[PDB]
Amino acid sequence: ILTQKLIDTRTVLIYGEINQELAEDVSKQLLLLESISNDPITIFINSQGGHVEAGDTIHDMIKFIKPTVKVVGTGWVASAGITIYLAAEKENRFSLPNTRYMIHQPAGGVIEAKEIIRMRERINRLIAEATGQSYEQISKDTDRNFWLSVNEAKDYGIVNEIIENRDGLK
Amino acid sequence: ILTQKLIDTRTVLIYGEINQELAEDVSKQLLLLESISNDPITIFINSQGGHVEAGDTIHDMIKFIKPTVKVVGTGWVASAGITIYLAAEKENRFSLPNTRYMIHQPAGGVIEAKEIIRMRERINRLIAEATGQSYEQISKDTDRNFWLSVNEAKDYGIVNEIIENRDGLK
Amino acid sequence: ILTQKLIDTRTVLIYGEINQELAEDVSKQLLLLESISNDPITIFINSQGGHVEAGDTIHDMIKFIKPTVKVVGTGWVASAGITIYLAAEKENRFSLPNTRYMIHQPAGGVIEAKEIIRMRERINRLIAEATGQSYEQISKDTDRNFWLSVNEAKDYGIVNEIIENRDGLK
Amino acid sequence: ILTQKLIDTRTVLIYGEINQELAEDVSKQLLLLESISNDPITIFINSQGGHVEAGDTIHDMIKFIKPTVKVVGTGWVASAGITIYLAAEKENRFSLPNTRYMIHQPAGGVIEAKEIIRMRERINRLIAEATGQSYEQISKDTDRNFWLSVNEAKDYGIVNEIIENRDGLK
Amino acid sequence: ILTQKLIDTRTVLIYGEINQELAEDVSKQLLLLESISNDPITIFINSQGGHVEAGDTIHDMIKFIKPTVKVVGTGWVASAGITIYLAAEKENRFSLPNTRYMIHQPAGGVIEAKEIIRMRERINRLIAEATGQSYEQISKDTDRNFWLSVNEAKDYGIVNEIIENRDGLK
Amino acid sequence: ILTQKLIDTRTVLIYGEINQELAEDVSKQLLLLESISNDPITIFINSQGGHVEAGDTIHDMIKFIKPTVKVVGTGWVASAGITIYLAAEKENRFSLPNTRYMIHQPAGGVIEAKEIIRMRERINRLIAEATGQSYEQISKDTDRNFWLSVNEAKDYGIVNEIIENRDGLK
Amino acid sequence: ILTQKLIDTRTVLIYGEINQELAEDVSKQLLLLESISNDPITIFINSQGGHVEAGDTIHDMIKFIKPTVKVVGTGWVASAGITIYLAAEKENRFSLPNTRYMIHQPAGGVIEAKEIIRMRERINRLIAEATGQSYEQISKDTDRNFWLSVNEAKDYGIVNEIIENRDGLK
């Protein structure tokens, strides 16, 4: 009854390091919610990032499932966490007020130099398409370490709407 | 029946270090209680603080949900714990008698100097608005380590009402 | 059925170190029992003490809840454990025969000198009011390490009644 | 059904080190069995001893509860384990054949010299009253390390009856 | 109801290191799903590889069971993970867009030289048959470390179809 | 249903080191099975031995309970494991074919010299009575390290019947 | 329902190191399946071997129970794993295609020289009888480290039938 009603909220929490264990847990939750109904799913994300391949799986699983996914950034959203956040369509990307964002991507993906370049190009294109920023702007910003405030992240094209209450997530 | 009646009390305990794990647990409890009814929720807080981003999430989740949240400070409330405590509206902020308060915030948030400054400014404004104290007073006090007694915390604008029994939380 | 009938006894055990984890567990049990009925609760305490803030929470939670709380000291009751024990009204403070008591309080509370003094003064006043001893007597005794026998603890005003059987807890 | 029928036997096992964790587990079992009925309880004890305060609690809890407690020594019963064993009335103290007994008590109770003496005097009187031996005999024997065979423990007044089968525990 | 509906999706996740523990878990899931119905099973694979013998078991179990197995590569698929991936028939081999592939096989299988050669020959033949590539091409590529993009893996004969949404897995 | 039918077999497994933890688990199983019915119990023993006092408890508990206990040696049965094995009556002592036996007993019981001698004498008499061997033969053999084959253990009087199939345990 | 239907498959997995813990788990599963019906049991074995006495128990338990046991080798089957594998009758011994076999037995059984010889002779005779190979051939091969391919293991008399699909296990 308790977990059953927790499933009824169609909410997924992605808090902490992005790793294969978290990717499995999130994948299971998303597949379970998909099998129940086509109703929208809300994901709250508080993550500093982690492993690139785990971030890739969560990103792709979000786009793969039939239900529309809304994301709500909270606390911080960085690196592989940003990749996950940007899986949702622009109009479905929300933020709580006390959140900072960083698109920096680890070079190794925390592998040869040719693969580091390929990985970077792939992620740069992903972020560019999702935000509406040019490839060159993203390429510069993924290779440095700067935090964006919630308002700056909105101006950047990461966050679409800043919300404080439930009625903003209508 | 046991956990079901524990949920009926609409009570959340925030005891110990503020971290992403605790933030997830608290977020789940708050979302679960919200889905059940719009009835008020009581949070008992005993925390020395912890990670800024986890504190930010809990703070924002308290304000995000529809139910009115009452907070009861107990033992100690410090740093990131203070940020969480101050998420409730002033008239909903209570304290048990044997509690001390400290608004000191860790510089690193336990990151570049520019971001340390930004983080401090954000938290200073948050605490100033919640307490009614000036920005300058808060800015001074977050950058030093001094404990306030329950009575001093009341005079400071952190605690609204000191309670010993159930009837005080009417 | 097993834990359900265990809850029917309205008994809470406080055995071992006083820490935030134990404080959370005890808080949950007390709140759960309160929500069921206003019937009295019995707490058996076997503790060497621990963390001051955790002791403060348990002490205050005992006084906060509506049900009358009876305490039964067993084995040993010391330091933060004494603070918890003294939360119950004098006529509700019992002891099993093979128990020793020590009111010694750790200076750091196991923090600046001004806060050590404040903490000590607060706890001294708490113990003085509960036992009926003068502030000066308590102040002397919290700053030294001496064990009281069950009979001496009774004479001191800590224990009200020494009991061996069930009929003594009528 | 399995644990429910295990509770129907009204049997408690005290195997291994006497510590606060074991004291809590045993206390819970004894209180649970008491709440069910006033029928006798059988305790099988295999213990080298442990912490004095934990032994004191179990000893006192055995005497505290309404049901009559029978004890069956098995393997070994020593030190704090002896204190627990002697909580039962003499005619309710049994032993399996392959058991050895030692009344040696650790000086520190595994604390000032005055308290070591007080502790020893208290435990000496306890053992003297339970066994029927003089204080002087017990005082000598608690301060040395000698094992008694099951027959010697019977002659000493520790064990009342040596049993091999169920019918002996009638 | 929750795990029951999770089983209804007939989905298996192979995330992380390929070891005997994972092989047991996957074997149990595949056998359980087979016993329920002959309906198709979908496996999502995110793995860097691991132990050759565990990979061999999962590969063979996929081919052993009656249900048709579809595989979906996600994040990365390498080494022993590739061996597992290639257990499915070519037309049942899918990939999510953000995935890289590497057919490199560890020489020791992470054992004498004669057995290293035998192992390599066996795996080379397996990969050659599944992909349609010549033995010589596979032999070269398993003995070097190069990552294939999702498009290159498709051209290589590893991936048959790249999918972004549910409708592509019709 | 699964553990319920596992209890219906009235089978207890004693595999691995003989310690107080295993003694507690075995004691609980034997008492549970006794409370259900007076039907025979089968114990499979694969043990190198362990702690003497734990072996003594299991030995005595086997003889204490009302149901007839059959033992089946498997793999190896040594030291404290032999003491347990010999708790069953001779005609109820079976062995699987691939089993070796050793009656060697550790001097310390893995304690003063006088107690080492007493312990050895007690165990020697126990083994002599169970096997039908003279005290002198047992005394020699417990103080050396020699393995008996299943056939030699039968000739020694440890094993009564060697069985390969179910029908031999009629 | 999930584990209940998993039991309906009458399948046991022996994956990883052969130890007393695994022997207990396998023994419990085999006894449980035997108590349900006399229907055949299938065992999938992926094991490098381990402890001789644990292997002996599993081997003997397979032969002891009434149901006919079929074995399926997968990944690798070596040493103590080979002993277990050979417990099944020749016509019930199957292999998945990607499996290697090694009959090497550790001298110590991973103990005096006389016992090493006895152990080796016992295991040599066991393997000789099961495979149809001469004692001399087995004696040579257990004392060296050489891997057999699935086809070589078939020619050796270890594997009877190589299967790829379900219909081969008819």
From TrEMBL, chains A, B, C, D, E, F, G:
<protein>
    <recommendedName>
        <fullName>ATP-dependent Clp protease proteolytic subunit</fullName>
        <ecNumber>3.4.21.92</ecNumber>
    </recommendedName>
</protein>
<dbReference type="Pfam" id="PF00574">
    <property type="entry name" value="CLP_protease"/>
</dbReference>
<feature type="active site">
    <location>
        <position position="104"/>
    </location>
</feature>
<feature type="active site" description="Nucleophile">
    <location>
        <position position="79"/>
    </location>
</feature>
<comment type="subunit">
    <text>Fourteen ClpP subunits assemble into 2 heptameric rings which stack back to back to give a disk-like structure with a central cavity, resembling the structure of eukaryotic proteasomes.</text>
</comment>
<dbReference type="InterPro" id="IPR001907">
    <property type="entry name" value="ClpP"/>
</dbReference>
<dbReference type="GO" id="GO:0004252">
    <property type="term" value="F:serine-type endopeptidase activity"/>
</dbReference>
<comment type="similarity">
    <text>Belongs to the peptidase S14 family.</text>
</comment>
<keyword id="KW-0963">Cytoplasm</keyword>
<dbReference type="InterPro" id="IPR029045">
    <property type="entry name" value="ClpP/crotonase-like_dom_sf"/>
</dbReference>
<dbReference type="InterPro" id="IPR023562">
    <property type="entry name" value="ClpP/TepA"/>
</dbReference>
<dbReference type="InterPro" id="IPR033135">
    <property type="entry name" value="ClpP_His_AS"/>
</dbReference>
<keyword id="KW-0378">Hydrolase</keyword>
<keyword id="KW-0645">Protease</keyword>
<keyword id="KW-0720">Serine protease</keyword>
<dbReference type="GO" id="GO:0004176">
    <property type="term" value="F:ATP-dependent peptidase activity"/>
</dbReference>
<dbReference type="GO" id="GO:0051117">
    <property type="term" value="F:ATPase binding"/>
</dbReference>
<comment type="function">
    <text>Cleaves peptides in various proteins in a process that requires ATP hydrolysis. Has a chymotrypsin-like activity. Plays a major role in the degradation of misfolded proteins.</text>
</comment>
<dbReference type="GO" id="GO:0006515">
    <property type="term" value="P:protein quality control for misfolded or incompletely synthesized proteins"/>
</dbReference>
<dbReference type="GO" id="GO:0005737">
    <property type="term" value="C:cytoplasm"/>
</dbReference>
<dbReference type="GO" id="GO:0009368">
    <property type="term" value="C:endopeptidase Clp complex"/>
</dbReference>
